[PDB]
C-alpha cells in the first residue's frame, strides 16, 4: 500500500523524466491542458496531459497548472518503471 515517491524523494520530477526519455531516444513531452473547471474561483481543478509525438503518455490532476503539470510527470515516471498501482501483486505463494 505504499506509493513509490513516498519511499523515494525526488525533486524536479520533470528534469528526471527528460533524461529518461532521452535514453530511449524519445522526444521531449509537450504539456497541454486536457480538462478545466472553475478557473477563476478559489477552488480550481486542472488536468494536464503530457503529449509525445501527438500521442498521450500521462495525465495528472492538480489545483494549479504548475502543480497539475508536476503531477503528470510523476504519473509518467511510475508507468515507465512499472511501479503503478494496478501492477501485478507480489508473490508469496512460492514455498521454496
Amino acid at each position: 500500500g505504499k506509493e513509490l515517491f513516498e519511499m523515494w524523494t525526488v525533486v524536479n520530477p520533470m528534469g528526471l523524466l527528460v533524461e529518461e526519455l532521452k535514453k530511449r531516444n524519445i522526444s521531449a513531452p509537450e504539456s497541454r491542458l486536457t480538462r478545466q473547471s472553475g478557473s477563476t474561483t478559489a477552488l480550481p481543478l486542472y488536468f494536464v496531459g503530457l503529449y509525445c509525438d501527438r500521442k498521450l503518455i500521462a495525465e495528472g490532476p492538480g489545483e494549479t497548472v504548475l502543480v497539475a503539470e508536476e503531477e503528470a510527470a510523476r504519473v509518467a515516471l511510475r508507468k515507465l518503471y512499472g511501479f503503478t498501482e494496478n501492477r501485478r501483486p507480489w508473490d508469496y505463494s512460492k514455498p521454496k
Binding site: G1, T34, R35, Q36, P61, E85, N86
Partner: protein, 49 residues
C-alpha cells in the same frame, strides 16, 4: 483457554466496517470527468474562439 489462544490482542470494541482493502481500485477511482466527452480545441460551452 482455547478462546484466548485464537485471539489477537487488539481491543474488542465496535468495528466500523467488516472489510478493509489497501488497493480498492484497479481501473482508477471515479472522478467527475470520467464519462464526459471532450470537445474539439477544448472549447468550453459558448466560447467563440
Amino acid at each position: 483457554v482455547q478462546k484466548l489462544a485464537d485471539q489477537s490482542g487488539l481491543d474488542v470494541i465496535r468495528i466500523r466496517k467488516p472489510f478493509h482493502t489497501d488497493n480498492p481500485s484497479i481501473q482508477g477511482q471515479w472522478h467527475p470527468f470520467t464519462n464526459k466527452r471532450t470537445a474539439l480545441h477544448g472549447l468550453r460551452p459558448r466560447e467563440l474562439r
